[PDB]
Write an enzyme that holds these catalytic residues in place. Sequence first.
Site, PDB file in Angstrom:
ATOM      1  CG  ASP E  37      -1.804   0.926   1.349  1.00 61.80           C
ATOM      2  OD1 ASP E  37      -2.041   1.453  -0.269  1.00 61.80           O
ATOM      3  OD2 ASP E  37      -2.905   1.109   1.591  1.00 61.80           O
ATOM      4  CG  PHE E  99       4.852   2.509   6.742  1.00 63.89           C
ATOM      5  CD1 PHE E  99       4.809   0.716   6.202  1.00 63.89           C
ATOM      6  CD2 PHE E  99       3.781   2.270   7.511  1.00 63.89           C
ATOM      7  CE1 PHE E  99       3.639  -0.049   6.453  1.00 63.89           C
ATOM      8  CE2 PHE E  99       2.578   1.740   7.627  1.00 63.89           C
ATOM      9  CZ  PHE E  99       3.122  -0.094   7.042  1.00 63.89           C
TER      10      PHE E  99
END
Lengths: 290, 820, 48, 375, 107
Positions: E37, E99
Amino acid sequence: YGESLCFVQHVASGLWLTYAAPDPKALRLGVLKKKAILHQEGHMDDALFLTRCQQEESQAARMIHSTAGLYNQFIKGLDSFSGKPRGSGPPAGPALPIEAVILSLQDLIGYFEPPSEELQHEEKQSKLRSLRNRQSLFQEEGMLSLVLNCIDRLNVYTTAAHFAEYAGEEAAESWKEIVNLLYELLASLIRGNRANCALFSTNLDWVVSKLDRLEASSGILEVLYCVLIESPEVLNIIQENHIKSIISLLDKHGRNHKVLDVLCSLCVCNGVAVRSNQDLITENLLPGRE
Amino acid sequence: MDILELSERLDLQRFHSHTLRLYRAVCALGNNRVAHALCSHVDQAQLLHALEDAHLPGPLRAGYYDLLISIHLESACRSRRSMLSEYIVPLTPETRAITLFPPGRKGGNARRHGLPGVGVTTSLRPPHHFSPPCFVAALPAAGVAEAPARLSPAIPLEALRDKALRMLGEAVRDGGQHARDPVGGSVEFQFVPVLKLVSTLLVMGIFGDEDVKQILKMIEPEVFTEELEEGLLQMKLPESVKLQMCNLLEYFCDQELQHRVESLAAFAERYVDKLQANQRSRYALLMRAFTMSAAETARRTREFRSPPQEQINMLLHFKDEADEEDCPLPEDIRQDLQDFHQDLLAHCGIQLEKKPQSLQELVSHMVVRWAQEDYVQSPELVRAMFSLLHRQYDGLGELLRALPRAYTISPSSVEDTMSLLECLGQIRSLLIVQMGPQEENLMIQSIGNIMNNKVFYQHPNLMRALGMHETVMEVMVNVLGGGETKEIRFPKMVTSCCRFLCYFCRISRQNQRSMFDHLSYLLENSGIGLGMQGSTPLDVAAASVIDNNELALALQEQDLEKVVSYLAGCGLQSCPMLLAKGYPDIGWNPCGGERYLDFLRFAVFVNGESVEENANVVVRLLIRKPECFGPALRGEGGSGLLAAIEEAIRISEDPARDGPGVPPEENRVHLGHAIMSFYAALIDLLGRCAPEMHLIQAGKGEALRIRAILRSLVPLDDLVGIISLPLQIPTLGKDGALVQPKMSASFVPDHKASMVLFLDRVYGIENQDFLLHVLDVGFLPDMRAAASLDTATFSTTEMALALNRYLCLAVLPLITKCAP
Amino acid sequence: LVYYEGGAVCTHARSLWRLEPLRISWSGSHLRWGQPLRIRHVTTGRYL
Amino acid sequence: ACFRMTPLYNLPTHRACNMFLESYKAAWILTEDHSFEDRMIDDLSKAGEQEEEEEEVEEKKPDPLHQLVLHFSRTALTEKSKLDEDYLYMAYADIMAKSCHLEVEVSFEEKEMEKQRLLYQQSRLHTRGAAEMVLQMISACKGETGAMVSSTLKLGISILNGGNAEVQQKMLDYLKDKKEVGFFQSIQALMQTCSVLDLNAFERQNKAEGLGMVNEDGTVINRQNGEKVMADDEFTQDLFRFLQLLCEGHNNDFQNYLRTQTGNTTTINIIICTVDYLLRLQESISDFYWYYSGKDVIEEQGKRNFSKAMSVAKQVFNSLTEYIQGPCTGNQQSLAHSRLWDAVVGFLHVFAHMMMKLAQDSSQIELLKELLDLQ
Amino acid sequence: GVQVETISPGDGRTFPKRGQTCVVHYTGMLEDGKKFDSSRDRNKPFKFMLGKQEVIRGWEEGVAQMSVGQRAKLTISPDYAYGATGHPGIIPPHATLVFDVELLKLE
């Protein structure tokens, strides 16, 4: 032949072939299957009406009668040499008719073509319900169960040589195509057959267990593919372990369009989806990406 | 590897296509969780750039297009189609504004038909609910499969719309070019995916009005010109692409029919207001016309005395011209109605340059031309072709069919109808997928919201037009189908199935009429409802038949026959759930018999009177099936009903004979009281089934012999003994605590009430000394019980209240008629 | 044991039965009332 | 309530608009007559530029009507355990029925011209496989009463009106070549499930109008439905009319085929089963006789029930006459040995007591006329 | 439990305070580096409210450690992260996450 009303009489006894009538407690059992007896008094409806049968049905019955005995002899031979390995010794018994078995299989598939798609819709449908009718009779007398017995008694031996040390060396070379053609015959019998797919719905674990076997991976996979397509009940009975087994099969045998199509058919059936099955497929296959 | 190299390497390309098919299958049929998972696995910009790329091989191109559809478009498309099939029109000033034909310089009768899909469609359509796909958020604390299912992934709808429109423009450019190399290796691979995406977007309705104009321009410029170029129709296509083309035009004609319906509803609003104003003026002249004329006033009165439906019927009835002079409505309010009628005739095409300039003739001509060009080999395309052809040639008849589905709603209840329609959409989407725990929770909460919904009470005809009860019965039978005999999955589900539809019964009798139409269909599935505890399809049929004597008359003898066959089976053997749970064995099932008996009671006794034909046929079925009597009144070797009641009380006193011996759930019935309830319901059945006293004095032989047969089968001495039997009364014990024998464990005065009801219905009460002895042996134990009841603690407990109902329903009317 | 049954079993090949005249030749000749004969079930192969 | 009602102007506008929408529907859309089947069928039959190409006619490509008929034939030949409802087939069968039939001193030339036009209208369809498709669709019906077989039999009537010899020949040849007993089994099942007059249902209906309490929607007291007695009278009538049209013109081969089918593995006797239905109808008419003689005079609802049953019986007798004419000796002998005689004696005594009680009073004169027609 | 690597330096005087909405622009990779994502995927920045814990608590801790106008690489241990369960389907169970975060503007 087809319009006469006929009494049947026995020469030796001289009595009348009659129906035994519903005996007491048969009503409680509810079975409409009732015995015939032989008595001179007889009953009012002792007269019989005789009706025609199709030559296709007669030929099917005759081939059933011969095939049952032949494969029964084959299974008894299997049992005969199952107990003790023959080793470096002849079986010392009547060898199973391997060539007759071979010919019988390709004869059965030659009886079991799928209809050619080029044929027009009329004759296509005709041969379709004829084939369905033959499959229904063949599962009714249950030679499918006989094929299951043969498959199990062959696959108890993992390898052709492993079968050879018990049964004989000459059968070892034939053994591979014997099991392959037997699985092909079972696929031909069960394809498009409600009764056969219902039987696999009763006992799926057979195919689940023998799917991992290498010798007839394509045949067993095609069998499972046909069962999954025709039967929605198998998809209901499938649990997580079966899906993991199929994924492990794809892993061990490599990438395969047939296996992926099997998984696709497992996903959805008759426009109704099993969310639990879809979730299991997702969680087991997709997150890895490898 | 490059996917463009994968194009040459077909085998790995074939595996990628099969991967795409598997992804479609796993995300298919609204599995939103798997859809979001797949949205994470496959990047969205990947799908967009795949749509852009033409070098990509055709099979993988179609795969990517269909995967995008099955990730984002599938669920909203299904829900939108399901809601679009039905037509609901609210009342709006915009509704008043909209008409069939746009005004213009062109003559009103001769106006050019408007381009399909332009204007305002007031029909309430569910706003597509999309979830912004973000998989890095915190995990929900709620448990899985009990938390509500989450929405479909979000997509940039407007950018996708413009991109699809310019892709269709590229397709038109390529069709004009007639280049040797097709996109994706074939014209089919070039057109079918783009047309499918256009179809999905149109189904969404995201395409704006000017977007619809450009779509019509690309489909056929000259036919849809507003006031060289080539048309998608003329440039000719293979069969499948023609199928997608027919789907697109079928959708456009669906909006054409929607426009017709909504404009008719608008005209209906205006004309109803005009009629109301005219009648307000007329009645104002009518309270005055009472004085001038008597015959005029009388004929005006008897006209108004007809119900409002008939009044509007006669007011509208002036088309035939036979009574157009007779109708009191003003000639102008007649004339505008005829003018609109001719306008509707012209719009439907009933009224009869070379290019058609009309959708009607355009579709007819294209279908006919395709038919001459080739003989279609694909039955699906043939069926779509001919269905579309019939729609075009006779859309007026299809309008006639659609009008009963059409309905009008007020703007005040539009917000509540919005929630009702949303819950309906959830239900219709749920019908497709098989059973699941999340699905059961979702439908339970949805039907709960519908039951709470105010419009559900307000507009009884609205859910008739919706027909939600049919779909609820469909989900009922799909749940019932699998493994019904051994066990029923989710009696919670079936209890919800009533509370919703069994309440729909309670709401309306026309609802009862519909379920009576579907009564036998519920009856074959009632073979599991008795097994499950609580609300059952048996009792939904009972609630349908009850209180409507027309339904009681229309009840079917064969349906009653299979019901009494179920009764015969449960009287033959006890229930396998009893056997498996291990309760003490009985040769027969009392509880299923009792519930069938109360169903038969609701069937035979309606509005306080018995129905003669059903009563007689029930007696016939009873004499056909002696197994229904159970052990009591066996016949040969027959221990009487009194002796069976004695043994039942013995069993009730006996511990663990009624219970497991291992009611923790309390749903399980004590076996002795189950037997007593069965035979009380049986005696009540024979009572309420016996004919009435007026028929007795009429002297009809069948009624008299039925009454005599009932008396002979059930002797009065058994009734007298049961009435005489002492009954345990909740008494003060254990240092003064009210010891309460629960009804499930004890014999009950409502059974006694069934006893006396059979007595005064069949045997009757005729002798003063007979009455006196019945009183002092059986009714005086009741009356000493009332003497005990006249206590504070007794008044607090509910069995005193049960005795109060018992007396007031059974003994008090008997005593009143015994007063002489 | 052979029984009198009614249902799909009638359609099935188990309901098929065959007649064999004692005379080996001209078995396919027209049956005659009271002719000596044998009854065989085709699938079983056994003579009733 | 006559004073209680909210006047339509004070009445809520949305419910009033629903009321008016239903009223306008019933009073205008039904009454508007729309004739489109003839033009649909002739446009479909016309084949543009087929002769212009002249190679596609040599290939014998079906024209649109033939293509549609072959599609219906494909759907019929497709096998399902349960017959599938087809709104498209109902619509198209209705269209073809209208296209064929298209329907006070008339001369010989006008009658002959009408006959020729009817023959040509029948030709446009039967030359396209219509008769074989109808037989296939009955075979697919398999004997379940429904709109499927209703439309199929109506199309059969519309193509066989006037005793179309070529249509009869095509149907007989198709039956002889496919040679499938399922068609006749379906016919027998449908004709068995054809209903008979019921005193019980009639009395239940009688108490229904006697009670007649109001319907919940608005105020609708004693709303009258289609009579439960003779629900399928039109189906029985057009089925027996189909058999009559099949035997029309004294087609001895097809009459013998209906009696017995030589080569079919199992043969059923439509003649005997029709006699059985006639006998059942006779017993039902006798039951109405006994109930009607129970009271002095005949009531109107029972009058209409009896008249519709008499129309059904008339259709049955015409069918039997078409069977036995020719004169087909085998059909004559089979009917003679059948149970016809008992049913005929029953109709005789019933008819006698009919015209007795009917001439008793003047009001029954029309039912007496129908009685004389049936006799 | 969160490891911070500043690819581009933040200003250091403006910081996200608890109770203020953050408009970030993130990219999420797996242990071996596969992207599941990213905000780049949506082309729209991800907006989240500090203190409501609507997103992973370890990630709010990392963002709070972050300054405004900053580009960073954050490794989240499983215990602060999804944990042994992971994210059903999207992130494999018992897997840590890494991330990449943009913080263009803070309101």
